[PDB]
Design a protein that fits this description.
The structure is a homotrimer of 146-residue chains. Chain A has 146 residues and is mainly α. In chain A, 76% of the residues lie in helices and 0% in strands. The first copy, chain A, has a single domain, classed as Four Helix Bundle (Hemerythrin (Met), subunit A), CATH 1.20.120. The longest helix of chain A has 29 residues. The relative contact order of chain A is 0.14. Chains A, B, C: Homotrimer.
């Protein structure tokens, strides 16, 4: 974990974000149970009957939050890991990881909590900024070593 | 690959799971062809006409299995890789990877095979357990190096 | 970045592909705005009224392209990284990464541009070939170190 000074901070933030995705998965399951809205007939038949194989807006919302996480957090897992080894300024790297962590936690709160627009959109944008920054830095480092 | 004693086992299990996801992708395509259920008008027009741009429950099921894989296997690729470098007991690490591999293969069989509830849900839970375990271990290691 | 001769090429191609996924995300948002097709009532109410919380075929197409990217590019991020450290022939490794990069960029163009079948399907197949190749190579290396 001490292979680079920024690595511990990266691993802390990334792992917290993975756990945060698992929290969304757990919430999704609980909403399915509460609202009796199952994706599969085999699930529905165990939990009240075939009529409960149905869509639900809250389930769909949970799935959107989880999908958006997959569209954003998974790239961060890659970019942040590589970036940790490019010798960035420790504080600067910290700030990249923290902005992503805070932005993404806020995104899930804004999504699942149905907060007014443009709160969710702003949190998404905030979090994407350090990702764009790391991506460009990796490009320069990779290109110059070709 | 010998950068850590647990790494070969991790790389074997992870790569098998990636191949298992590709198998789901291949099955999905075959179901689309068999059931004539295409997502795109350009596909449908090559394969019988515009009426074949349509949803199908078996195609949707394949997509759910693939999506669930993305929600679970992708985090494992990250967590398991990092965990391999934290000096875990070789046998203990093996067990983490094997439980995930077996649980996830069983999950796909239970999903695509339409096995009775709660078989699929149990396989998902089984496989998530070693992921939660690795995530916590990474948190402790990262935090203590800050 | 010089931990292995193939690594710079891998990091260049992978990071470009992550940026290419972000481009799809940006396009998706712009299509939502242009076509007034929002996934969430809170978005719709800021942008003209509740009737604009609705699906749209172009938005759905963008989401399919992005999802297909998640089904294919994310595995490449893992496989290509590991493969970079297995001492492959530099030119051979380059070719694996370039075929994936070109195939995937072409895939997005074919998907979003609604090009005739089987153009998109062929680009997908082309790009999967080096992934299958790397996966098998990782399997052999991992297995022989057990
Ligand atoms: C900077 C970056 C780097 C890497 C990847 C993506 C991006 C990136 C690119 C673009 C955007 C990006 C693009 C449109 C954006 C925004 C951000 C924001 C914050 C708004 C809301 C505003 C502030 C106008 C408001 O409502 O007042 N719009 C309009 C909008 C609103 C709803 C929907 Cl569904 C789609 C589009 C956000 C990003 F994170
Ligand atoms: C432990 C862990 C670590 C990390 C991430 C997630 C989790 C995790 C957390 C919670 C669960 C978790 C939550 C509800 C669960 C289960 C597991 C299981 C196995 C059941 C079925 C039972 C056994 C009751 C039955 O039917 O008899 N329920 C109820 C249920 C059933 C169907 C649907 Cl769609 C949603 C919820 C599964 C997990 F893997
Ligand atoms: C080789 C590999 C390695 C790893 C993972 C997957 C794969 C992999 C496996 C299979 C395929 C794979 C499977 C069916 C394929 C193709 C490739 C191609 C190119 C076609 C179009 C043809 C050429 C027949 C035409 O239309 O003339 N079909 C038929 C088809 C068409 C549309 C839909 Cl929705 C589903 C299936 C593509 C792959 F990339
Ligand atoms: C990481 C997981 C974050 C979970 C954030 C959940 C925010 C829940 O927020 C709640 O949402 C309800 C309906 O959506 C509203 O009725 C409540 O007013 C609101 O408190
Ligand atoms: C990694 C890929 C695993 C593929 C597992 C596929 C299991 C197929 O299982 C089959 O499913 C059919 C319909 O779903 C049933 O009619 C059959 O009884 C059953 O054998
Ligand atoms: C990485 C992002 C790639 C973007 C490729 C977008 C290709 C757009 O292609 C355009 O699509 C329109 C409708 O789909 C058609 O009407 C136009 O003829 C076509 O030029
Ligand atoms: N897949 C996204 C691509 C763009 C994006 O990520 N937008 C942000 C800010 S508006 C978001 O939170 N999207 C909601 C979602 O993905 O469900 C979408 O459909 O909107
Ligand atoms: N996205 C999941 C989150 C929870 C989850 O992964 N549940 C397991 C056990 S019930 C599952 O197999 N879900 C089916 C699916 O994701 O389609 C869901 O909608 O259910
Ligand atoms: N999830 C894919 C699995 C197979 C696949 O990736 N097919 C390629 C070639 S036909 C594709 O471009 N699929 C379109 C898509 O995923 O939306 C599907 O539903 O088709
Ligand atoms: C998409 C808008 C976000 C801009 C990200 C800024 O990212 C910055 O880019 C500079 C030039 O590449 C780099 O020198 C710098 O290290 C990086 O932080
Ligand atoms: C979510 C329920 C799964 C529990 C995972 C247990 O995980 C365990 O956690 C302990 C305390 O952090 C660790 O000491 C131990 O290494 C780890 O295997
Ligand atoms: C799914 C069809 C794609 C085939 C990928 C070919 O992949 C090849 O496999 C050989 C045998 O494992 C390896 O010796 C070779 O390094 C690899 O490039």
């Amino acid at each position: 974990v001490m292979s680079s000074p920024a690595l511990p901070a990266f691993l802390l933030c990334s792992t917290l974000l993975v756990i945060k995705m698992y929290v969304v998965a757990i919430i999704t399951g609980q909403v399915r149970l509460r609202k009796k809205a199952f994706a599969n007939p085999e699930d529905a038949l165990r939990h009240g009957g075939p009529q409960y194989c149905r869509s639900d807006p809250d389930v769909e919302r949970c799935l959107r939050a989880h999908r958006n996480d997959m569209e954003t957090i998974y790239p961060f897992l890659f970019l942040g890991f590589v970036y940790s080894f490019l010798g960035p300024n420790p504080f600067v790297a910290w700030m990249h990881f923290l902005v992503f962590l805070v932005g993404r936690v806020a995104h899930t709160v804004a999504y699942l909590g149905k907060l007014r627009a443009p709160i969710r959109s702003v949190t998404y944008t905030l979090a994407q900024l350090p990702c764009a920054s790391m991506a460009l830095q990796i490009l320069w480092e990779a290109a110059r070593h070709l």
